[PDB]
Amino acid sequence: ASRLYTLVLVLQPQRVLLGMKKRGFGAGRWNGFGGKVQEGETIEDGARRELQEESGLTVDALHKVGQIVFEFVGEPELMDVHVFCTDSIQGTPVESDEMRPCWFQLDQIPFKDMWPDDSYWFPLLLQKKKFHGYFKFQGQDTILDYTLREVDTV
């Protein structure tokens, strides 16, 4: 009962690119770029695709950085989210009807306006650590329980 997702963070030495979703699941929040993995597509191909479609950027090298499973109480389907990072992009970010991308200084990451779990794992991502995580949600704002451990292999 888990569905594959990707999430991609474009992380440079002094800044990170986040996208503000204008509509649908996660609307109103800053987040990385991602979505459901498709039939006949690898997780990494999915990650690269999601980044292009949502941000307009071209990425070559994607690095695995974590796996997070999300549980929403009362929803049968679990989210199995494969998180990736990259430093090497091509293109300039594109604002669309679906997504407003913006760069953030690493000290000005807008956690109050991000999924609440980000406050836990994003500092690991920033210090180039790899992680396995699980977050149980009630609704979209409340973390009931969670586990988060660093790992050598994602």
Write out the residues near ligand GN6 by the rule CB under 6 A.
5, 7, 25-26, 31, 34-35, 70, 79, 81, 115, 117-118
Q: What are phi and psi of 57, to 5 degrees?
A: -90, 150
Q: For residue 98, say whether it is annotated as part of any ligand binding site.
A: yes
State which residue, 13 or 25, has the beta carbon closest to ligand GN6: 25
Q: Minimum distance from CB of 5 to ligand GN6 (Å)?
A: 4
State which residue, 63 or 111, has the beta carbon closest to ligand GN6: 111
DSSP H helical ranges for 23-109? 43-55
Q: For residue 31, say whether it is annotated as part of any ligand binding site.
A: yes
State which residue, 27 or 61, has the beta carbon closest to ligand GN6: 27
Angle at 96 between CA 141 and CA 29, to 5 degrees: 10
Q: Minimum distance from CB of 44 to ligand GN6 (Å)?
A: 14
Q: Minimum distance from CB of 50 to ligand GN6 (Å)?
A: 7
Q: For residue 39, say whether it is annotated as part of any ligand binding site.
A: no
Q: For residue 95, say whether it is annotated as part of any ligand binding site.
A: no
Q: Minimum distance from CB of 70 to ligand GN6 (Å)?
A: 4
Asked if 34 and 45 touch (Cβ cutoff 8 Å), the reply is: no
Question: What is each CA distance from 126 to 23, 49, 130, 153, in whole angstroms?
Answer: 27, 23, 10, 17
Nearest to 76 by CA among 152, 3, 12, 17: 3
State which residue, 34 or 93, has the beta carbon closest to ligand GN6: 34
* Ranges assigned E (strand) in 13-74: 15-21, 30-31, 33-36, 58-59, 63-72
Q: Which residues make up each annotated binding site for O(6)-methyl-dGMP?
A: 6, 21, 31, 115-118
